[PDB]
């Protein structure tokens, strides 16, 4: 025990007096620093490099001074450590925090956030639960450890299992928060989620009464959202070393939890004050459906804004947080309620893919090829559930059952999809296809079936054909007629909305236009027609007019049509795989969006519609079209970079009954206008569609009928051969 | 430019005090942590340099004979914390706190700066800027 204060003059030794208070230390030692004993020494050196002497000081102190001291909430608690010493010391010693930058706002008075309205209150200790109420466990039932389906009926009904996995199998883990800004946190981990891309990374660690979501952008500042039990206090690391307890920025603690926001943007850098907005997320509800509903909502919203910026900074953070806290909710809900449901465990699998995609691609701007994600949850064993379902498929259906069989099939896949799942997905598409040619709309059940059928077939020279043929089918299904309805759907759904009491889900508003390749829907001709179809939905009409300005209604209709162009077609990775032929040469037009429409043909080939002068491919220029808005149908080849012009020969249609053999099928009936507007892409799928093609207006299918249309309407038939033909009649 | 692996060795403690300032000598440096679990069973001392343009703190080891550079503000904060607990009692301990009090009062201020953009990894690879 030695306290010794020295004064240095020139460098030989120093002039000092050493004062030991209560204990014996080697006194002659001071000629050499007190390394010998297990005790640590401290040396403060003040030297002005003018060669000026300054002064120094020393205290040798003992070793022990560095050593520290219904749902059960008292079993696995959240305990903050005092310092790095008994904890993970690596990131704290090695951080550039406080040296290069600071994770916290420089102004301490901006640290304390206000509590949001939607945040939990004494009367609502947890949050707001969504209306399709979580089914109560039947009184008699006993719950198995894990979740399993041994039968087909299991998916339709509710399947229950115990949340005990949370309390029994768990791991105590130390957590270093962002940039070592706060001392570590011991917690019992119920799960983790990782989402990565080119332009973004988000790490989500979740445990009993605990969540950490680390959110980072290549183009933006990182933030961490930490959730602790309200009774818990976190300690911020700061420059001034003598202040022992300071609270990292955040709002006041609530009934259930306390939330902390680490990272800058609180005082200034945020576009608005969303600080209190994002912090409120974990305290807004325990219903995972609630957060995901809000996620799907901002998803659609930002895809309309896709034009100006590849990256939406705010929306990225938001949808990230939402995704994260939903897993926090779900885990914490099960713990609190002692049980779980099968739908819940399956749903988060699909939600973790579909939302991450939109998060990284559209939100972060990253290349879709590099979008990946991983989840590890103790109450979830997806790979076991996969094998269970794999053996289920391996041993007539209504759209409802199909929607459920496909959803769970998409939710659990490692990339291995059961053959009969695909077979079901195909049949769903085609059945919707034959439906949509006679009728211009789809009910919410139909859309959900289409959605999952698509995601299954585009999931992964066999599977390649599925990608091409579905993109073909999606494109055909999307007509001028349907697009106006489909956009009205998205608009109506967003118009009448209840974040508080109801779920919003994208598959409920879906349509083939979201899965097609068409960039022409934002063209004035269509957007204008959309506006004129608004009063046909009087409720939606009144909502729009009583808030949005007449000018803004156009923007609205433009912005919703945008979704159909940007959802699939704008993704290059989807194109590059299923239509490499478009990209084969020095071709710019693909990425310059000069290709308005893309029509996959026999392998190695696809048609194209371009407004400009085509620099490649076999070119059919329709000459009846207005010159200022030209339509050039172009047949592209993978191995052929040559540029030529074809002749459109004309043929006539036989009598519908005349041939039981089908020489027509596989072609595409394209209906356009002399104004340069592309309307209907309809494929001839079956011998019956062919019969309806030969019809004069005795055809059920309207684009095949030159009556409901008008003089401007013209039509052309595209063979997969590359042969383009005019029909007589 | 010139980087720093975070540590040179030293066989004495008189070397560290007379050692130059990484702040002045180099441009960009990297703080480092010793390849040992428990610092206490190893670390023989802590040296603090106040008047450097970017004040620094050195963790010196006897047996290892290595001297590591660590975050000046974070380390001393974690120091004054662990020795400042309610249950801790000593007159020696008070001398530590007496010395640890006005450490950064003379030297240059801490950063008000915003960090740089880009992804962040977790604790495993300590706050690394990479996405995947």
């Amino acid at each position, epitope marked *: 025990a030695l306290l010794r204060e020295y004064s240095d003059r020139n460098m030989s030794l120093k002039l000092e007096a050493f004062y030991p208070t209560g204990f014996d230390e080697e006194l002659i030692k001071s000629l050499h620093w007190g390394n010998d004993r297990k005790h640590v020494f401290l040396v403060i050196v003040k030297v002005n490099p003018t060669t000026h002497e300054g002064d120094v000081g020393l205290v040798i102190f003992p070793k022990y001074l560095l050593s520290p001291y219904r749902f059960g909430f008292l079993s696995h608690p959240v305990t903050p450590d005092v310092s790095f010493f008994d904890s993970s010391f690596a990131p704290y010693l090695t951080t550039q925090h406080l040296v290069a930058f600071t994770t916290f706002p420089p102004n301490p008075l901006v640290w304390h956030l206000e509590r949001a309205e939607t945040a939990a209150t004494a009367e609502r200790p947890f949050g707001v639960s969504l209306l399709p109420a979580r089914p109560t466990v039947p009184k008699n039932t006993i719950l198995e450890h894990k979740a399993h389906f041994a039968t087909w009926d299991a998916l339709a009904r509710h399947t229950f299992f115990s949340a005990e996995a949370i309390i029994t199998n768990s791991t105590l883990r130390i957590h270093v928060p962002l940039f070592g800004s706060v001392w570590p946190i011991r917690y019992w981990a119920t799960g983790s989620v990782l989402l990565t891309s080119d332009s973004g990374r988000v790490e989500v660690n979740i445990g009993v009464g605990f969540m950490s979501s680390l959110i980072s952008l290549s183009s933006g500042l990182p933030i961490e959202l930490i959730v602790v039990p309200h009774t818990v206090k976190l300690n911020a690391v700061t420059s001034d070393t003598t202040w022992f307890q300071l609270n990292p920025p955040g709002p006041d603690p609530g009934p259930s939890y306390r939330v902390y926001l680490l990272g800058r943007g609180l005082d200034m850098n945020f576009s608005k004050h969303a600080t209190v907005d994002i912090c409120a997320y974990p305290e807004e509800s325990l219903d995972y459906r609630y957060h995901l509903s809000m996620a799907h909502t901002e998803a659609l919203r930002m895809t309309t804004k896709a034009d100006q910026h590849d990256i939406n900074e705010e929306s990225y953070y938001h949808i990230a947080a939402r995704i994260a806290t939903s897993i926090f909710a779900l885990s914490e809900m099960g713990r609190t309620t002692e049980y779980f449901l099968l739908d819940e465990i399956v749903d988060v699998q699909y939600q973790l893919k579909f939302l991450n995609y939109i998060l990284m691609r559209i939100g972060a701007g990253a290349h879709p090829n590099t979008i990946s994600g991983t989840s590890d949850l103790i109450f979830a064993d997806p790979s076991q559930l996969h094998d269970e379902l794999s053996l289920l498929f391996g041993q007539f259906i209504s759209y409802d059952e199909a929607r459920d069989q496909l959803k769970t099939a998409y939710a659990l896949s490692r990339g291995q999809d059961h053959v009969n799942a695909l077979s079901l997905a195909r049949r769903v598409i085609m059945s919707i296809y034959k439906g949509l040619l006679v009728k211009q709309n789809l009910n919410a059940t139909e859309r959900q079936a289409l959605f999952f059928a698509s995601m299954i077939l585009l999931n992964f020279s066999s599977r390649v054909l599925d990608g091409r043929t579905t993109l073909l089918l999606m494109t055909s299904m999307c007509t001028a007629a349907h697009a106006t309805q489909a956009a009205l759907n998205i608009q109506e759904g967003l118009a009448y909305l209840n974040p508080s009491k109801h779920m919003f889900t994208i598959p409920n508003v879906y349509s083939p236009c979201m899965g097609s390749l068409r960039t022409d829907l934002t063209e004035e001709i269509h957007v204008m027609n959309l506006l004129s179809a608004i009063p046909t939905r009087p409720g939606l009409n009144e909502v729009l007019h009583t808030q949005l300005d007449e000018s803004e209604i156009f923007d609205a209709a433009f912005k919703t049509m945008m979704i159909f162009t940007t959802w699939t077609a704008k993704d290059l990775h989807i194109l590059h795989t299923h239509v490499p032929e478009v990209f084969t040469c020095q071709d710019a037009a693909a990425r310059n969006g000069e290709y308005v429409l893309i029509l996959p043909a026999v392998q190695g080939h696809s048609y194209v519609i371009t407004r400009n002068k085509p620099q490649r491919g076999l070119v059919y220029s329709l000459a009846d079209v207005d010159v200022y808005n030209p339509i050039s149908v172009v047949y592209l080849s993978k191995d052929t970079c040559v540029s030529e012009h074809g002749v459109i020969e004309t043929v006539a249609l036989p009598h519908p009954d005349n041939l039981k053999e089908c020489l027509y099928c596989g072609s595409v009936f394209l209906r356009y206008l002399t104004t340069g507007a592309i309307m209907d892409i309809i494929i001839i799928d079956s011998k019956d569609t062919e019969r309806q093609l030969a019809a004069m207006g005795n055809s059920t299918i309207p684009p095949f009928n030159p009556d409901m249309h008008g003089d401007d309407s013209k039509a052309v038939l595209l063979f997969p051969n590359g042969t383009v033909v005019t029909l007589l009649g | 430019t010139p980087l720093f692996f975070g540590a040179k060795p030293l066989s004495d403690v008189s070397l560290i005090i007379t050692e130059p300032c990484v702040s002045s000598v180099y441009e960009a440096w990297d703080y480092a942590a010793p390849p040992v679990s428990n610092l206490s069973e190893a670390l023989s001392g802590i040296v603090v340099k106040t008047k450097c343009p970017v004040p620094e703190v050195i963790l010196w080891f006897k047996d290892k004979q290595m001297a590591y550079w660590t975050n000046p503000y974070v380390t001393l904060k974690g120091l004054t914390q662990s020795v400042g607990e309610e249950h801790k009692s000593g007159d020696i301990r008070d001398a530590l706190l007496d010395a640890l009090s006005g450490v950064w009062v003379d030297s240059t*201020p801490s950063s008000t700066n915003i960090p740089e953009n880009g992804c962040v990894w977790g604790a495993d690879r300590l706050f690394q800027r990479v996405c995947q």
Partner: antibody
Framework: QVQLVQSGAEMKKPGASVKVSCKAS????????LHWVRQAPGQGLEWMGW???????TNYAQKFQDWVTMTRDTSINTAYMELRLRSDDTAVYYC??????????????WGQGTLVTVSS | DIQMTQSPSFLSASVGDRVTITCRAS??????LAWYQQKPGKAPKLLIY???TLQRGVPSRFGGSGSGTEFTLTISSLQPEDFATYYC?????????FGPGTKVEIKR
């Protein structure tokens, strides 16, 4: 040794304008805020406001808001306080260093004070 | 603007006693409060910077405790040198308010 020397002492008639100076030492001037607190005879303490010696920015109390101005000089490490005397302003004026960068309001070190008398 | 209350306003005690001064805030100050010692004719001196923490160099006889709206300063063993008036101060706000102070004399 951190020290602050104020200067020196003076008397000014009502309606005038007075300047008090604080001479820094022992610490980094740019790195810690400067606070002003005045004390009437036989009365308690009243916080007038603070100034960031680096930023130059000032924070004032409502009572002194239109009646006071605070300024510094980064070179000689001095801070200045200029007040318009309403004749109720007779007091001793102190300047003090904020000792905590992340917590506002902690006066770690004080000056020796300057008595200002207001009379005709 | 938070108003601060101190009780007692005045007290006198004897050497060796334990003096307890109290501080009251209009609303929750959480961790942030200070305690100052002003001798007659001299400048204020900081005692307790956080609610509970003793400034290095200040005698161990001085201590503090509190949270929220209520804080208490305690002199463990009173000495003749302790004659002063003691103030409490709000910390970490745009407006920093002082307690009215507590006069402490010494009985012989």
């Amino acid at each position: 040794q951190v020290q602050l020397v104020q200067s020196g002492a003076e008397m000014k008639k009502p309606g005038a304008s007075v300047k008090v100076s604080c001479k820094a030492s022992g610490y980094t001037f740019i790195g810690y805020h400067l606070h002003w607190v005045r004390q009437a005879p036989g009365q308690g303490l009243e916080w007038m406001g603070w100034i960031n010696p680096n930023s130059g920015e000032t924070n004032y109390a409502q009572k002194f808001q239109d009646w006071v101005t605070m300024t510094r000089d980064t070179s000689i490490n001095t801070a200045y306080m200029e007040l318009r005397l309403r004749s109720d302003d007779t007091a001793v004026y102190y300047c003090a260093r904020g000792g905590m960068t992340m917590v506002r309001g902690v006066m770690m070190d004080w000056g020796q004070g300057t008595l200002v008398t207001v009379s005709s | 603007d938070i108003q601060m209350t101190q009780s007692p306003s005045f007290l006198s005690a004897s050497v060796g006693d334990r003096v307890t001064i109290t501080c009251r805030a209009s609303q929750g100050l959480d961790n942030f409060l200070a305690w100052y010692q002003q001798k007659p004719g001299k400048a204020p001196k900081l005692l307790i910077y956080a609610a509970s923490t003793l400034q290095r160099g200040v005698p161990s006889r001085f201590g503090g405790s509190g949270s929220g709206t209520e804080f208490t300063l305690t002199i463990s063993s009173l000495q003749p040198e302790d004659f002063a008036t003691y103030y409490c101060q709000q910390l970490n706000s745009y407006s920093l308010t002082f307690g009215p102070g507590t006069k402490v004399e010494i009985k012989r």
